[PDB]
Amino acid sequence: GSHMPLSSENKQKLQKQVEFYFSDVNVQRDIFLKGKMAENAEGFVSLETLLTFKRVNSVTTDVKEVVEAIRPSEKLVLSEDGLMVRRRDPLP
């Protein structure tokens, strides 16, 4: 969308896609994602990593748009510097 913005509705759609990858059901089956989460004790995963996932990549290629899409979430928490995101809740 280099030429057009990511609307509020599309931000909400992307928000749910990020929540999808981090959901209790999915995360427990994702060896790659769990591997990234285990790189630090807070379970933070870089937004650039998220940009490589299909459901995110089809919507945006800019970490800054991912930050705006994610912020409203009550299931995810952004790092102080806005370059990473983690689950609000501990692994099941």
Indicate the number of domains in the chain: 1
Q: What whole-number distance in Å separates Cα of residue 76 and Cα of residue 89?
A: 8
Residue 22 buriedness (CB in 10 A; 0-12 / 13-18 / 19+): buried
The gap from C-alpha 33 to its chain's centroid, in whole angstroms, comes to 11
User: How determined?
Assistant: X-ray
* Resolution at which this structure was determined, Å: 1.6
Please tell me the distance from the alpha carbon of residue 51 to that of residue 62, in angstroms, as a whole number: 8
Structural domain boundaries enclosing 60 = 1-92
What is the CATH classification number for the domain harbouring 32?
1.10.10.10
Alpha carbon 62 to its chain centroid, in Å, reads: 12
User: In DSSP terms, which residues pair with 78 in a beta bridge?
Assistant: 85
